[PDB]
Design a protein around this ligand. Structure first.
Ligand SMILES: C[C@]12CC[C@@H](O)C[C@H]1CC[C@@H]1[C@@H]2CC[C@]2(C)C(=O)CC[C@@H]12
Lengths: 216, 219
């Protein structure tokens, strides 16, 4: 498998600007008769991939005239000239120069915006999840940019690890932010054998963590 | 509309079998290859193998040999992929793509078929409310939430006040904890709308025929 690699995972881009993406191969891509089968797909959200550029530099029918291609042998690069709003999606690169065709992980165009920090909010269990046994404490680390943020769950000073399952939201199309949430799922006697519950998140914006809490 | 048009979503338990059709329309079916590509959840877009309509013999990447099989009925312009003794890792979207003989790319892609392999039985969600226990104003905006835990299958739908509140609503992706799914939604209102005005959390689970309205009551 000719490991195909692409960086960056996510490329913030102010629309109007120009984006350039790159891809690299765990072998060389000149086929055994001077042809280079490196092709790039665009996958818009919960839709299909669709050929944009083949044989390194040729543009698929209809594909808009600001897209470009270049690269030799092992480093290829796609370039978009004035990225318009509907060039946004996961750009993948593939090779069918060696058996078997392989795909690289893709790089997503994302809109850029000034930073913000998560409005965190922290919720204890409700009487009604308690009258039957579990207790899911739930923190909402809402409305932040950039995507990396990390949550830690401090339980009575100590830390907890089994119980977190986090889940992330797609870049909100109204203010380009992200949101994330972790619900610590404890049983009702794990929850009632503790008292201080604090949710904690270090995001790029504050050096200090943006902790929040309730005291059981 | 030269398209390859595929079957619908499949929900299978372990050990079962699924057969995906891919109808080609608009083009000379013998003139291309049909390739099958697997898109697995936050794994790579993976190439499964290929079918050559002139001979009729497939080719398979090692990784899907044996248990995956590709059949064909070239009179009826339909291509096929059959999965037998469905394991749990086969949950992914499988796509068929027409590849070309001169320039070797894959230019028309079907819309993909979603198989979901699981052991769960339908379960209506438990819906619980999330009100902030006198967790005072950090700054004049309360964010409440709903937590819908333990359900199968996807989907559920959350709305707040029957869709009359949507600018402050975030609903987070499902994450299955132990076969069943879990999901939460938060609304952020001004502090004078709630608790003066009510805020209700409405979740519907089409597969089980269950709609639950929860009111967020101060605490
Ligand atoms: C690269 C590879 C890869 C598989 C190998 O068996 C044949 C070669 C050459 C022809 C290609 C094929 C991939 C699938 C293609 C692109 C088709 O669908 C028709 C021509 C095919």
């Amino acid at each position: 498998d000719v490991v195909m690699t692409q960086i960056p995972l996510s490329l913030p881009v102010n629309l109007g600007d120009q984006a350039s993406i790159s891809c690299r191969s765990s072998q060389s891509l000149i086929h055994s008769n001077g042809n280079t089968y490196l092709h790039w797909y665009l996958q818009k959200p919960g839709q299909s991939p669709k050929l944009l550029m083949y044989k390194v530099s040729n543009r698929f029918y209809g594909v808009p005239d600001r897209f470009s291609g270049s690269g030799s042998g092992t480093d290829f690069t796609l370039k978009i000239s004035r990225v318009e709003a509907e060039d946004l999606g996961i750009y993948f690169c593939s090779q069918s120069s060696h058996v078997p065709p392989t795909f690289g992980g893709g790089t997503k165009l994302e809109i850029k915006r000034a930073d913000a920090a998560p409005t965190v909010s922290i919720f204890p269990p409700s009487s009604e999840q308690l009258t039957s046994g579990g207790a899911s404490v739930v923190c909402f680390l809402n409305n932040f940019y950039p995507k990396d943020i990390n949550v830690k769950w401090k339980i009575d000073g100590s830390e907890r690890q089994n119980g977190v399952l986090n889940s992330w939201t797609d870049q909100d199309s109204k203010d380009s932010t992200y949101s994330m949430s972790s619900t610590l799922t404890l049983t009702k006697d794990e929850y009632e054998r503790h008292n201080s519950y604090t949710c904690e998140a270090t995001h790029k914006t504050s050096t200090s963590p943006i902790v929040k809490s309730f005291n059981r | 509309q030269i398209q390859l048009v595929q079957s619908g979503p499949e929900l299978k338990k372990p050990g079962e079998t699924v057969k995906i059709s891919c109808k080609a329309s608009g083009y000379a079916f013998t003139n291309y290859g049909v390739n099958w590509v697997k898109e697995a959840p936050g794994k790579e877009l993976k190439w499964m193998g290929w079918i050559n309509i002139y001979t009729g013999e497939p080719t398979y990447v090692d990784d899907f040999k044996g248990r995956f099989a590709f059949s064909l009925e070239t009179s009826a312009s339909t291509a096929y992929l059959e999965i037998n003794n469905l394991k749990n890792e086969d949950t992914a979207t499988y796509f068929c793509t027409r590849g070309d003989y001169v320039n070797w790319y894959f230019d028309v892609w079907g819309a993909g078929t979603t198989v979901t392999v699981s052991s769960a039985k339908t379960t209506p969600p438990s819906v619980y409310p999330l009100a902030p226990g006198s967790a005072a104003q950090t700054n004049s905006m309360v964010t409440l939430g709903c937590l819908v835990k333990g359900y199968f299958p996807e989907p559920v739908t959350v709305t707040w006040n029957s869709g009359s509140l949507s600018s402050g609503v975030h609903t987070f992706p499902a994450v299955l904890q132990s076969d069943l799914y879990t999901l939460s939604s938060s609304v952020t209102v001004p502090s004078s709308p709630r608790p003066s005005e009510t805020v209700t959390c409405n979740v519907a689970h089409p597969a089980s025929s269950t709609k639950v309205d929860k009111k967020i009551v101060p605490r």
